[PDB]
Every structure is written in C-alpha cells, then in structure tokens.
Amino acid sequence: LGMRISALQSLSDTPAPVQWLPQYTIDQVAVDEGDAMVSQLTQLPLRPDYGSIW
Amino acid sequence: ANVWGVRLADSLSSPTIETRTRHYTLHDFYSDLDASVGKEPWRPLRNQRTNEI
C-alpha cells in the first residue's frame, strides 16, 4: 500500500463555508461534456437571498 | 367606482413579473419531511385580539 504514515489532526467544525482557490493541470476535456455534467450535478433552481447592491 | 357600496381606488396596478416554476425533487421532499425550524410545512395562524395559535 503505497501510502504515507501519519495520524489525522482533529479540527473544530467550521460554522460557515470557507473560500477555495482551484489549481489547474495539463489535462483537457471537451467543453460540451463539462457543461452537461455541470447541468447534471447542479442544484441550480432555487430562490437566492437578494442582497443590497448599494 | 362603486359596484355595490364597495368603493374602489382611482388608480390601477397589477404584477408584471412571474417566477419560473420549480419542479419538485426528491431532495426537496426529504427536506420538507425533515421539518426543520425554518422550513416547516405548517404555518401557524394567530387570533388577532389575544394572540394565540
């Protein structure tokens, strides 16, 4: 089993979602497949909480 | 105008924007069945004079 040896560190549960910054690689996929899977995996229909623009 | 003792305001108004329909999903059904504090399927009604449900 080619895996490292260490013990997990316990963290307190975060009340709010944390920001994430993705990083890209050399692999590429067709745009249509990505759009189709975004449509398949989304929870897109809902009512957002509209904020104060000004 | 007064149809039958019912006075009507001079102005006219009506909504103009209609929201798109949201299809019912299984996750939504489970969320309704959870009966969370904010999403209870029952809305209480209160008597106006003395305020009891």
Residues of A in contact with B39 (CB under 8 A): none
- Chain B contact for A51 (CB, 8 A cutoff): no
Determine the residue of chain A that is closest to B27 in CA distance.
A43
What Cα–Cα distance (Å) separates residue B41 from each residue in A18, A49, B28? 31, 20, 12
Residues 6+ positions from B39 with CB-CB distance below 8 Å: B31, B32
* Through-space distance between the first and last CA atoms of chain B, rounded to whole angstroms: 38
Method of structure determination: cryo-EM
Helix and strand numbers, DSSP H then E, in chain B: 1, 0
Determine the residue of chain B that is closest to A45 in CA distance.
B22
What Cα–Cα distance (Å) separates residue A36 from each residue in A17, A32, B31? 26, 6, 26
- Chain B contact for A46 (CB, 8 A cutoff): yes
Q: Where are the beta strands (DSSP E) in chain B?
A: none
Residues of A in contact with B20 (CB under 8 A): 45
Resolution (A): 3.4
Task: Compute the distance between CA of residue A14 and CA of residue A29 in angstroms, rounded to an integer.
Answer: 34
